[model samples]
Target chain A: MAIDVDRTLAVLRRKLEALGYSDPLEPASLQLVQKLVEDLVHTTDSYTAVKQQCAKQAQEIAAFDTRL
Target chain B: DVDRTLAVLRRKLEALGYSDPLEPASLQLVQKLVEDLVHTTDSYTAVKQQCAKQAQEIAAFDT
Candidate 1:
C-alpha cells in the first residue's frame, strides 16, 4: 500500500517535472492540484477496478491521527 | 479481479504518465500524502477542507 502511494505520486511528479516548469511544490503540491481536480477524469473502468482490488476494505478500519 | 485492479492502476499511470498492483489497499497514507502535497496552499483551510473531503475521495479510490 505504501508502495502504491509512492508509485502514484511518482507518476505525478514525473509528469509535473516533465513540464519543465520550476518546482511548483516540494511536499506533494502536485497532489494538491490533482486532488482539486474534478473526478470527470475518473472512468467507469478505473472506477470499478478500484473496487475489485479493494472491495473488502472493511477488513480493517484503524484510526489514523491527523493534527489540526 | 486483480486484472481489473491492474487495469485501473495502469490507467492511473498512463493518465498521469503514472498502475491494483497499482491499486492501493491503504488510502489513509495516500490521504496524508495528498495533504502534505498542498505546499502552496494559500487558503490553508481550503486544503484542510479538501483534505476533509479526501475522506470521501478515499472511498472513491476503493471504487
Candidate 2:
C-alpha cells in the first residue's frame, strides 16, 4: 500500500478531530477507517457505475414495495 | 497561456460524467478557481490528491 497504516489512521484522526467525530478514537474505529481507505484506494468501481447500480436497486426496492 | 491544466480538468470532468462537449472559453473561468491550489500535469495525480481529500471525509464520517 502507498499509505502506511499509521499515517492513514493519523490522517483520518486529524480529519475526524476537525469534523467533531469523537474523543479518544477507538480501536475498531481506526481499523474500520483503515479498511475503508484501502478499499477506496484499491477499488475499480467508477462513481457513475455505483450510481447506476443504486438506481437499479432503487427500482427493485420500489417494485418490492408493491409486491405480495 | 490557456494552459494544459485546463485539458486535465476537462478530461477529469468527462470521466466524472460531464462528457458533453464544453465551450472552450467557459472552462477557463472554472480553471481560474485553482489559481490558489497546487497544480499538476497528470489527471491521476490530480484525482489522487482528490482521493486523499475524500478518504478523510469518509473516515471522518465513520468516526
Candidate 3:
C-alpha cells in the first residue's frame, strides 16, 4: 500500500480519537474503524487499497483467531 | 442518505404545492427517527413493508 493510505487511515483514527473512542490506536478499534470506513466508502475505489491494508494490519495486530 | 432523501422528498412536495412538515435532519438522526417511526407509528405499516419485502426475498431464495 502507498504511504498515503496509512496517512488517510491515520486521519480516521484521529477522528475516532476525537469522538472519545478510547485508544483509537488500539488494534481492535483501529480495525473496526477501517472496516466501517471501507463499508462507508464502498462507492469509491481509490481508498480500497488503504482499507485492505488496514484490515491486514488489524489482523496482524489482533494476532488471528483471538477475540475480534 | 436519509437526510438527502428527506430533502428531495420535501422539495418534490413543495413543487407539488405541499409543505415540508419537518426541520432539516442529519442522515444519522433521520435513521434513528425512522427506526422510532416504525416502532411507534400507531400502525404496522413500516413493519408490514419490511416483512413483506423481506418475506418475498426469502421466499425467492428458498425456492
Candidate 4:
C-alpha cells in the first residue's frame, strides 16, 4: 500500500535530465513512457494486493482441509 | 515470474539514460522495485500451489 512511485518517477526524471533529454518528447512518446511507468507501479500494486488476498484465502482453504 | 518484466523495464530505463554513470544508482532503485515485485509474485505463486495441493487432498479424501 505504501509503494512510493514518486521516488521512482524522480529517479526517471533525473536520468532523463542528465541525458540532456528535456521533455516535449513528441507528446505521444512522453505519454507512452508515462503509461509504462504507471503500468509498472500499478502492476506491482495489484500484485501486492492479490498476493495478500491469495495468502489469506489459501490459509482459509488450508484450515478447512485440516478440519476434514 | 517478474524476470521478463524487470528485464524489459531495465532495457527501457537504459534507453532512457539509466546506463553508465547514471546506471548504478538508477539500477539500484529499479532493482529494489523489482525485488519487491518478485517477492509479491512468489507469494502468489506459493498461494496458488497451496490451493492446488489442498484441492487435490480434499478431492482424494472425498473419494
Candidate 5:
C-alpha cells in the first residue's frame, strides 16, 4: 500500500532532482505522472488482493472437480 | 496473465528508470497496461464469486 506510493514518489523525486530546473512544462508533466502513478498503485493493490482470493477459490473448486 | 503483463511493464519502467527522460507516450502505455490489469482482476472477482456460491451450495448438501 504505502510501498507503492512511496516508490512512486521516490521515482518522481529522483527525476525532478536530476532535472534541477523549473520550467513552464515541468509542473504539468509532474502532475500527470503523479496522477498516473496514484491510479496504478491503487489498482495494483486491489488487483493483488482479488487475484489471491480467486486463486484460493480456484483451488477449492478444483478439489470438487470430479463432482461435476 | 496479469502477473506476466505486470512483470513486463515493471521491467520496462525500471529499465527506463528515473534517470531517463520521461515521455508522454510511456505514461500512456502504463495507463493502458493498468487498464488491462483492471479487466483481468474484474474477471477473477467474477469467477471467484461464482465459485464461492457453488461452494456454499455444495456445503448445503452435506448439512
Candidate 6:
C-alpha cells in the first residue's frame, strides 16, 4: 500500500505555492491542506472502497472459520 | 462521482488562481480551495469513524 505521501504533499505544495509562500514554515499546514484536497476529491470513493474491501475480507474470514 | 469531484476541484483551482494576489500565497486563499479542503477533511473524519466502528463490530463478532 504505497500511501503516496509525496504525491499528496506535492499537491499541497502547489496549493501553497499558489497561496504565495516561497518556503512554507508549517509543513503540517500543507498536510492539513493536502488531506483536505484528498477528502474533497477522493472521500466517497476512498471510504466506499475501504468499507467494501474490509467487509469482503471479513466475509472471507468468516468462511475460513467455518472450515476450521 | 468523478464529475462532481472534478467540478469541485476545478472550482478550487480557479479560485486558487485569484486567492491571494497581494499576500504571499500560503493559507489565506479563502476561495473554493478552503471549502474543498474542508469538505474533504470532514469526509475523511466521517469515513474514519465509520470504518473504525465497522472494524470493531466485526472483530467483536469474531471473538
Model 3, residue pairs in steric clash: none
Candidate 3, residue A23: how far the Cα is off, in Å: 1.0
Candidate 3 segments exceeding 4 Å error: A1-21, A43-68, B1-63
lDDT of 2 by residue, B1-63 (tens): 454565677678889987423343323422332221112212334455555555565455446
B1-63, model 1: which lDDT tens digit per residue?
Answer: 864675665668778753222223323444554554332232333443444455565565556
lDDT of each: 0.43, 0.45, 0.47, 0.57, 0.58, 0.56
lDDT of 3 at B54: 52
For candidate 3, lDDT tens digit of each residue in B1-63? 775786687789899997554422222433453344333332333333544555465455446
Every model's DockQ: 0.03, 0.02, 0.02, 0.10, 0.08, 0.13
Cα deviation of A7, candidate 2, in Å: 11
Ranking by TM-score: 5, 4, 6, 2, 1, 3
Q: lDDT: which candidate is best?
A: 5
Could you tell me the lDDT of residue A37 within candidate 4?
54
Put down candidate 5 lDDT per residue, B1-63, tens digits, no spaces.
874675566568778863323354554555675565456556655765776786685576557
lDDT digits (tens) for residues A3-53 of candidate 1: 443565676567545653223332354454455342213322343444443
lDDT of 6 by residue, A15-39 (tens): 6566544333345555565665564
Relative to the true structure, candidate 2 reaches a TM of: 0.22
Residue A32's C-alpha lDDT in candidate 6?
62
Where model 6 places Cα greater than 4 Å from the true spot, the runs are A1-68, B1-30
Clashing pairs in 1: A28-B37, A51-B63, B5-B20, B9-B19, B10-B19, B13-B18, B19-B22, B20-B23
lDDT of 5 by residue, A1-68 (tens): 33554565466556545653232135656564557556666666776676677677667666677666
Question: Can you write out model 4's per-residue Cα lDDT over B1-63, one digit (the tens) per residue?
Answer: 674666677678779977433335544555565565456555555665666676676566657
Q: Higher TM-score: candidate 3 or 5?
A: 5
Give chain A TM for each model in order.
0.30, 0.34, 0.30, 0.51, 0.49, 0.41
Among all candidates shown, the one with the greatest TM-score: 5
Clashing pairs in 4: none
